[PDB]
Symmetry: T
Subunit: 161 residues, 12 copies
Amino acid sequence: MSARRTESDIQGFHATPEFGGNLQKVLVDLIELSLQGKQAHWNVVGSNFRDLHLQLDELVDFAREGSDTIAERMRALDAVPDGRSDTVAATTTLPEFPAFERSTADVVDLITTRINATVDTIRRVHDAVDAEDPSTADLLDGLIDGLEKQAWLIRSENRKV
Amino acid sequence: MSARRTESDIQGFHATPEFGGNLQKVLVDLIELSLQGKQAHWNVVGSNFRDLHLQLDELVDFAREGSDTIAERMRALDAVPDGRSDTVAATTTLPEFPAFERSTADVVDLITTRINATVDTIRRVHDAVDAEDPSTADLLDGLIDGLEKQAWLIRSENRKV
Amino acid sequence: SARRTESDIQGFHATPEFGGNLQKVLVDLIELSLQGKQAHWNVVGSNFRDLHLQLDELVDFAREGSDTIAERMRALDAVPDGRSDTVAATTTLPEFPAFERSTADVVDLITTRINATVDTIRRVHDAVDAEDPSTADLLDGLIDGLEKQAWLIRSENRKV
Amino acid sequence: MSARRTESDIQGFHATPEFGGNLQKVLVDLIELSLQGKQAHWNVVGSNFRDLHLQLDELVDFAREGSDTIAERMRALDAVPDGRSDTVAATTTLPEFPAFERSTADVVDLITTRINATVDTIRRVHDAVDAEDPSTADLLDGLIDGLEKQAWLIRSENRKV
Amino acid sequence: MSARRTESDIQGFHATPEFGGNLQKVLVDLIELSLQGKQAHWNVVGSNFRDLHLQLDELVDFAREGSDTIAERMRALDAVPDGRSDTVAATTTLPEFPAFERSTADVVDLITTRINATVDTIRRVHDAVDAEDPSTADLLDGLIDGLEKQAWLIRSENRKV
Amino acid sequence: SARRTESDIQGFHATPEFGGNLQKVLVDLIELSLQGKQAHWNVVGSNFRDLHLQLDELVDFAREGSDTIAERMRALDAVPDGRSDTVAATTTLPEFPAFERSTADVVDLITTRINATVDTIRRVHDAVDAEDPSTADLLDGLIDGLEKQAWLIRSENRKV
Amino acid sequence: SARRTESDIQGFHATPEFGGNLQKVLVDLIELSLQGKQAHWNVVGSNFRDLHLQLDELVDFAREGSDTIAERMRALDAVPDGRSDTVAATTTLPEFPAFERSTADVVDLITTRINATVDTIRRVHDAVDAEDPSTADLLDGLIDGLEKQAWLIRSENRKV
Amino acid sequence: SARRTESDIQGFHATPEFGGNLQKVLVDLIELSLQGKQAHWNVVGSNFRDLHLQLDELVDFAREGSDTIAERMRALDAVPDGRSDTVAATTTLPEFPAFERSTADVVDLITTRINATVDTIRRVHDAVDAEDPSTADLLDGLIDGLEKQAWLIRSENRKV
Amino acid sequence: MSARRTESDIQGFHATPEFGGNLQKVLVDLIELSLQGKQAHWNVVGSNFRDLHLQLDELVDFAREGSDTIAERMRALDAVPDGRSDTVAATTTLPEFPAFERSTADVVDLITTRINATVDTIRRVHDAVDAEDPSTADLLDGLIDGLEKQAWLIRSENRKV
Amino acid sequence: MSARRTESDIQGFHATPEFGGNLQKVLVDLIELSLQGKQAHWNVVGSNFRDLHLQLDELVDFAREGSDTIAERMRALDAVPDGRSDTVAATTTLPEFPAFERSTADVVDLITTRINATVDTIRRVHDAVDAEDPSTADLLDGLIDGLEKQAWLIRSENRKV
Amino acid sequence: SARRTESDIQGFHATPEFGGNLQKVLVDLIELSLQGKQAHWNVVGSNFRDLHLQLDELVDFAREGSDTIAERMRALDAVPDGRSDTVAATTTLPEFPAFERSTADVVDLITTRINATVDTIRRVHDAVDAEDPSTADLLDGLIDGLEKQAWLIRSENRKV
Amino acid sequence: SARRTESDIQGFHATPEFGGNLQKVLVDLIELSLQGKQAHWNVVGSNFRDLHLQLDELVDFAREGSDTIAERMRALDAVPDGRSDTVAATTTLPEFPAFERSTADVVDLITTRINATVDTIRRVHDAVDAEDPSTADLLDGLIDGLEKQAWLIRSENRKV
Ligand SMILES: [Cl-]
Ligand SMILES: [Cl-]
Ligand SMILES: [Cl-]
Ligand SMILES: [Cl-]
Ligand SMILES: [Fe+2]
Ligand SMILES: [Fe+2]
Ligand SMILES: [Fe+2]
Ligand SMILES: [Fe+2]
Ligand SMILES: [Fe+2]
Ligand SMILES: [Fe+2]
Ligand SMILES: [Fe+2]
Ligand SMILES: [Fe+2]
Ligand SMILES: [Fe+2]
Ligand SMILES: [Fe+2]
Ligand SMILES: [Fe+2]
Ligand SMILES: [Fe+2]
Ligand SMILES: [Mg+2]
Ligand SMILES: [Mg+2]
Ligand SMILES: [Mg+2]
Ligand SMILES: [Mg+2]
Ligand SMILES: [Mg+2]
Ligand SMILES: [Mg+2]
Ligand SMILES: [Mg+2]
Ligand SMILES: [Mg+2]
Ligand SMILES: [Mg+2]
Ligand SMILES: [Mg+2]
Ligand SMILES: [Mg+2]
Ligand SMILES: [Mg+2]
């Protein structure tokens, strides 16, 4: 049948190249945050090492799930993610993480900055993504929420009051 | 009480008949997708049968949770879902699923089309739902995301590259 | 060596009549599932929560049941039809009403529909048993499970 | 780096005092709903006591997770929650819950009203929150959905049909 | 079209008084077995105490699950179980368990005999139950299997070469 | 250097009076378990499901209770008797009636049964405490759990 | 037969004084929970994460505690009052400050407030024990749990 | 009063014919398990992973099956033989070939193996049922599970 | 309203030196028991090896949980535990566990005696502990119950008829 | 930059025929052990039946996990396992398990001897395997540890004083 | 007493060469993880789902591996570098292509890249072993795990 | 045909030198466990909670370690001694001090204790490896886990 469509080939929602590009921006920063998070996780030393060591893993977990979500959202919308090391290094907006052992206080500031850069990328892209596909913008909202929570849980260590 | 409201009867948000109708459209297609998913799950044969057999169940799981979510969202907003077989058959927009055993390749195309029809119903209704109640549109966004992911995981089997 | 010679050993195949009997069971289990969910959402009134929850348990059982029967058909070279049009046209269950319904009414309605489903299974049981006792064993589980659901639901309306 | 930002101090999104105030409104009503939920949970008596006793705990669970989510969302955005008893009592919009044992029927009406007041606070604040930060409005949508579901699961007990 | 039945009061399967009485016989022996299993579990002493102590609890779990199953099957089929202590003591076919402590060797023989007696009751009513209701006989088959396995696990302690 | 030089250090032995006191608790816990299941099966009427479920929770608690008490007796070298004949002959709980009973009747009956069981524990509490505080602590656990079950069950019939 | 005659056996009822004592414990446990959550969100500075997490554990315990006490009141026919107005007006705990607070300050503040809560429980303990040792046993668990939380929190600020 | 007065109540003993019938089932289940693992390791080609995984599920089912049958024999005082020499000498299943095999070949080979195993169970079913319905019920479970595995495996090669 | 106290430094319950010394006595015997339980667990041989091997690990788990509980209760009450090996060896009241392999029968008697001794220490300090702090005495009650149950589970292997 | 290799077909480690034959020897004894362990598990009777019955299943689980590990290691290294019944019977070094029921004491000695033989095969090929592939030898080390632990847990039943 | 005198006992320290060797292993494990995820998202064609899933399992293993090696470096006073620039500049793995790729191609590509990763581990193995066998034991686990992944992936493309 | 014809195949026996070497490892693992709990209870000051928690993880690892070593000794028919007197008399670990200790002091003390324990394992490693590689593999596991704990603990005091 009464209301049954009779088409044999019904196509899905396809992302525009601009939309694909916007998600690619989010993906590389998520991946760069994950790699920097692990680097910090390994090389942090000094007062309250353990809390930071542990919290940094939780951040990485969240960042990894985020990258997988974004990349697979691209696939669903017929876009093609690039999460390769050369691409991430050449295109990330995140300030470089320093080499060697870094103190807990330094790591807190460094990582907070890098989380904030990552969230800023999502925020800058948010409205263009929403205008085309609110469902994908809803995924961005989850990323913003979780990442900004991580920033709070990490930065609070250095707060002097 | 200081700031306490003094009303004994405070009423909740009620859905308009248009809104109720829009959710009913989503519900029957979700249910029809679930029934067609099981039909495909049982009758698929041929190369890569198992992967498809398994993925089709995952689709059904998602579609069933979606229908329950939508129907109960209607109840919360004082609307009345109808998920009975006669209603679903008479009102679904999904193209009919064929009888008998179907090859893996045929099932992939058939189900992808039917997922896409279901998502299209949600997409067509999305803006009217959002305008009245953003919370319900947020539920739709979850459905769009999950269903379009299922389409990608299923259709990729037939992609020639 | 007692090893067999054949390179192609075939499995048990069901008769058309056998397939037809399981199809009868299948459509009534599916119908019961859909009616179960309908009642689950639309029940209101005294002791709403208990019935709301129990009906979800009835649906779970019915859905497991339909999958089991349809896949039994597949194992025996029969082809199940669980599509909405077929279910609607061939189910023996009394139609479940639309709209909100009282707990008391939902109890009576659902009990009747569970019983109709059990009746289908019971009336194909012997013919199924005669051909394949292992399938009849599957039917026995459904009879037990559904009749238990009937008891758990109908007891709400029992007086003294 | 090639695209790497060179800033050492990148700041996060900060909530305006208006935004902070709006979340504080949601927080105190969530907390007051939790406290009233427990009061009802303990003191409800009469026909269908158990179902209500159990459902009221589920409501409290949801309300508690909601308050923690909102308060921590404030922290992330550099706002400062106040969930202390004096503040909650002096600023909640929820009508007072009565003392002593109350019948199941009375508790159903009382709690439904109080859930509805809580949701109304979220709904009244929703658009201002969305305009500043869609991610936080997405959190509100989850609260609206869950709370309105609780209202349906509780109020249906008293529905005469 | 429509194969739909038109009756509004379709009745369930009702057991005959004889059938009910046969399941009642099974029920009381299963309960008696549970009580005796617990008695032995507490009061066994001697070589290999722990194994028998533990195995006896597994017997009791099986027997308890069994009695609940049979009792509820009675209820489903409109029969009325009597599992009260006075009835169990007055009607069980199981020989009494002796008082005070018993050796491991004696407990093995005693409990094995009581399992045998319990299975014997189930086997005695099996054909009559099967004739009326194959589904209930199937439940009996499970009890027979499970109980005879317990008998083997317990009795094998005393079997020599 | 602080090590004791006995080879056979004996443990705490319960007196036979203590054993009999725990024996009183044990039979009433077992009787409650048996009556709880009878109610669980045979309850019918308004709010069946809630009572059906709550009665199983009570039985779970009472079954754990009787195991704890019997094993506490064994730990202190007393010997429990939880056999059917003994339970029926020595329990202080009023007999549970035969046949199906309404939810309202089952609420009143079971509450009385729980209260009789708690009373037995309260009656022996101080004599048990005087000999062995640790055992009285176990009794305190039972008192708390049983009285909670009494409250959760009786509330169905309370009118305000 | 040792079976009792009564059809209506009543349970233990608490005195008004007893109910009042548990109410005192209830409001301080609730206050501690709310203050615990406040501190949990608003703590900042050195070793933030450890205290953030520990304070959530303190809240969990306090919430379990309040539910346990309030439901104990219900079991014994007493009526709990856990509403925000009542809690604010009748709690003995020093007010917890608004706004962000250093880890060191939060440690001192929360320790003091845990101790005030333990003090309430300790000062009603004997009067509760004299009437109902099973309730006093519940109080013992709270004393142990909260005093353990006090140790785990305060140790952050301990010097040498 | 209804209590039996024997001290040595004997249980149900299986006849030696029954034992041998279950012995036939046992060796084919064990052979299937061994051949299932060989296929699991040595399968290669298009859709390797699915078959690799499904073959392990089949082996799981067959391993549980042989334990169930051997222990059922023991329960009825029969004595199982699942030793390698016995299995190889008395199994009715066609030998599995050596070396790596394509997924298509493995599908055909394993399906034939499953079908031969089910045939053994179907051959002895009625003689087993005549002596002990409960054991035949176990056979029904095996028939259902094995034929399902046959369907899940063979479907990879079906062309429509 | 206000019943609020106004002190900013409310002190916790401090144990007397005598009380601390009494819990220290319990602690060392619990640790000694754990060490001896492990020794027996490794070194027992003979009839019914496995049961005792397994039961001894359950004893050790209980004793370890016990020592941690007592030690931490000391800390909570401002006392300082000493669970170091030298102290445990120099101050435990438990008779030494013999070296090398011991028969199952001997291990049963040996360990039972050592549990009895451990419980005896707890019973000796019980009243003095109860007089100062009923809450700590309650923890002792749990140790008494648990340890005496272990004693029964172990010793019953050697009890005859 | 760049240390990247430029080959498009990089080969994996291939085992020599001798290496493959050595793992095949381990495989058949592990399978034979599993089959014999199950035989004993079913057919053991007498004092301490239950413990041995249970311990034998733990042996079988270990041996089964072992054979799968060795077989798959063969596959990874391009060798081809033969775990067929005829091959296992014709090539195993394990002495045959006797038929029918055996006493607990006999099963202990019999199974201990068969574990010893299985470990002996693994120890005989260990150095030759280590010389070619240390990673496979490491897998052998795990089998040696696990099997010799099982031997101790089983054999200790028969060890006296 | 056999107790040592020192108040400061130092742990095993790795040589610069040792640290360098583990760094080589680290960057290739990280590269493999990133390439694994790339393939996981971008694979299309026949048997997509199996490879999609297996590649996620390869990534899980590689990520556990890199964490293990980097933390082993930290334990031995070496300093890991897992940053994207360093990984890209110093990895020995052939570059994985951008864009969609067929299952067959992804199988070949990933197998080659797994093998390149295993080769790095194998070529530092002896030098690592000579200095610290416990670290070489960790390398053995990676060799086993990755070579198992290579088998599970490459078997899709194997003919006859 | 390949079957061995001995009836008493003996297993691998450890030499007494090997046994004593594992005995050295065992006492230091037990001492570490005991000292770990002392630190766990008595640590106070800045970052108490982290150290309190990490010290329990170390004890968990060391307790599992000593069980593994003692049971490995038993497997090879050696006989362990983990009694208090033996441990105190033969351990090589420096005595842990009495009384409360600051987190900083506890970090230094425990790290030294871990390092002394690892040193014992490293000292006996090659003699153990020469007789039985499988046991040396167990030692490798201990070395890895203990040194990781050393790194996770010491890092609290590291200044850069
Ligand atoms: Cl933590
Ligand atoms: Cl899969
Ligand atoms: Cl419920
Ligand atoms: Cl066991
Ligand atoms: Fe993924
Ligand atoms: Fe639902
Ligand atoms: Fe299925
Ligand atoms: Fe939180
Ligand atoms: Fe039940
Ligand atoms: Fe027990
Ligand atoms: Fe509660
Ligand atoms: Fe088994
Ligand atoms: Fe602890
Ligand atoms: Fe496998
Ligand atoms: Fe890590
Ligand atoms: Fe152990
Ligand atoms: Mg910390
Ligand atoms: Mg959302
Ligand atoms: Mg949104
Ligand atoms: Mg596949
Ligand atoms: Mg049957
Ligand atoms: Mg059956
Ligand atoms: Mg209810
Ligand atoms: Mg035993
Ligand atoms: Mg007490
Ligand atoms: Mg207590
Ligand atoms: Mg090694
Ligand atoms: Mg290793």
